[PDB]
Ligand binder design. Structure first.
Ligand code: HEM
Ligand SMILES: CCCCCC/C=C\CCCCCCCC(=O)O
Length: 455
């Protein structure tokens, strides 16, 4: 039999839209998922899609033969400034595959070995900042993490120094980026977009998009006039040719790739580091574990690519935090052809599916009766994890291109942090997750007491 698609309350023409009227749509969806189960329909004026939570359905949606990446309404809005960069372009769009081939090289084992040096340059600035702090002062976690992350990707990928640590006030780019994301998020809940109330929001949107592009222009101009021979993402965007077409990326797309790597290559990571640290502080013994592991592997003042690969446990911390709170909370698919999801739900071609990643990682049938617990050990034997049970980095051909960059950076820094400081939850911070499409702990602050070890 065919099961009637379960779905939340409707408000006439508004459908389920009013349900999403909030600062935290994903978390709301999680609750609705909790109340409706493995799958439900969410309809709104014009659009309609199905949010999946269970692995059994996820594993199906994650079948390239039947489902390809769909641009969720969120991403459609992000396209306004991210254009057809990797993250926001359709699979069957010339620029995607092209850029994929052209840019992929910048994320190989060897490359990571080259980036590592610069990563440490930033990581040190961080430890330095935290070491230069005095008694009464405390650290603002996600603020400094984002500070770290943007600087790292900028240097590593474009050889441009945002110098985030040289400013107490948020780098302009960040400020405009968060606003553009936030607006993208707000548009999802809008009933009538043309309403002259949104006029202001639109003027501000353009404003922030322009600021982002202004930076791109500075990054490129800075590259032109420099003593080069840099083998980074930038030189690859500007020079690499897609071997399948022999053609290189056009300026319009190259721009899009810069914006894309600047945003995608920093936000999700800092969010990850913030959540990780949150959990470590809230789970002292796990912290203690990760602290010792670090203390013994990082024998050198400044960590090596290999020593970082030796930070087994801290990596587990990372995947656990990434399990409970996946920074990029969801990805979308579409029925490549008419089919039937789970043998119960009939899908027509082009039917949108939405994967609530944070829920998939709470599936007790996979993780057990304690899903809500921060237990790094769950990742002691990676082999145990059924595929499609842990999908924090997207799926298949359209998966995180920078995945390893993130984890290598996160591990490095998390390792160093635990190596040099005593972190105290001086405020018993209650978790508050701020949503800007991406997830991050807001107002998370701590105090780092020096172990007084140099670097
Ligand atoms: C913990 C951090 C990160 C998380 C959780 C994350 C997650 C993801 C996810 C879920 C997607 C797929 C979205 C979809 O299927 O619609 C994705 C795509 C992508 N990510 Fe990441 N990401 C992270 C870090 C990075 C970094 C550091 C870079 C680059 C330096 C990066 C670059 C990209 C790009 C370009 C894509 C588009 C891939 C494509 O569709 O061709 N990501 N990432
Ligand atoms: C290219 C720009 C960087 C990527 C920014 C967005 C990253 C991931 C998107 C997560 C979307 C989560 C959707 C929640 C909102 C909803 O479903 O209604």
């Amino acid at each position: 039999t065919i099961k009637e698609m379960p779905q939340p309350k409707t408000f006439g023409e508004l459908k389920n839209l009013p349900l999403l009227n909030t600062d935290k749509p994903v978390q709301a969806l999680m609750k609705i998922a909790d109340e409706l189960g493995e799958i439900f329909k969410f309809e709104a004026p014009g659009r309609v899609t199905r949010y999946l939570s269970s692995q059994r359905l996820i594993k199906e949606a994650c079948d390239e033969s039947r489902f390809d990446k769909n641009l969720s309404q969120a991403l459609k809005f992000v396209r306004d400034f991210a254009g057809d960069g990797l993250f926001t372009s359709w699979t069957h769009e010339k620029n995607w595959k092209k850029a994929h081939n052209i840019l992929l090289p910048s994320f190989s084992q060897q490359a990571m070995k080259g980036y590592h040096a610069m990563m440490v340059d930033i990581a040190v600035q961080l430890v330095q900042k935290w070491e230069r702090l005095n008694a009464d002062e405390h650290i603002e976690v996600p603020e400094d993490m984002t500070r770290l992350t943007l600087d790292t990707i900028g240097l590593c990928g474009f050889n441009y120094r945002f110098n985030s640590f040289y400013r107490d006030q948020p780098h302009p780019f960040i400020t405009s980026m968060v606003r553009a994301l936030d607006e993208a998020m707000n548009k999802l809940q809008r009933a009538n977009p043309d309403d002259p109330a949104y006029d202001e929001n639109k003027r501000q949107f353009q404003e922030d998009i322009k600021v982002m592009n202004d930076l791109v222009d500075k990054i490129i101009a800075d590259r032109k006039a420099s003593g080069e021979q840099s083998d980074d993402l930038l030189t690859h965007m500007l020079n690499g040719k897609d071997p399948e077409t022999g053609e290189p990326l056009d300026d319009e797309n190259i721009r899009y790739q810069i914006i894309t790597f600047l945003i995608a290559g920093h936000e999700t990571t800092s969010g990850l580091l913030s959540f990780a640290l949150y959990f470590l502080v809230k789970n002292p013994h796990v912290l203690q574990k990760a602290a010792e592991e670090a203390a013994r592997v990082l024998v050198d003042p400044v960590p090596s690519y290999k020593q970082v690969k030796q930070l087994k446990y801290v990596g587990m911390v990372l995947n656990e935090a990434l399990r409970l709170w996946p920074t990029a909370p969801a990805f979308s698919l579409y029925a490549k052809e008419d089919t039937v999801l789970g043998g119960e739900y009939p899908l027509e071609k082009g039917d949108e599916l939405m994967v609530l990643i944070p829920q998939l990682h709470r599936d007790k049938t996979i993780w057990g009766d304690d899903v809500e617990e921060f237990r790094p050990e769950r990742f002691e034997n990676p082999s145990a994890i059924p595929q499609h049970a842990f999908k924090p980095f997207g799926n298949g051909q359209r998966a995180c291109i920078g995945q390893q960059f993130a984890l290598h950076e996160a591990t490095l820094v998390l390792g160093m942090m635990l190596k040099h400081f005593d972190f105290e939850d001086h405020t018993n911070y209650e978790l508050d997750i701020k949503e800007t499409l991406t997830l991050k702990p807001e107002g998370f602050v701590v105090k780092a007491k020096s172990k007084k070890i140099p670097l």
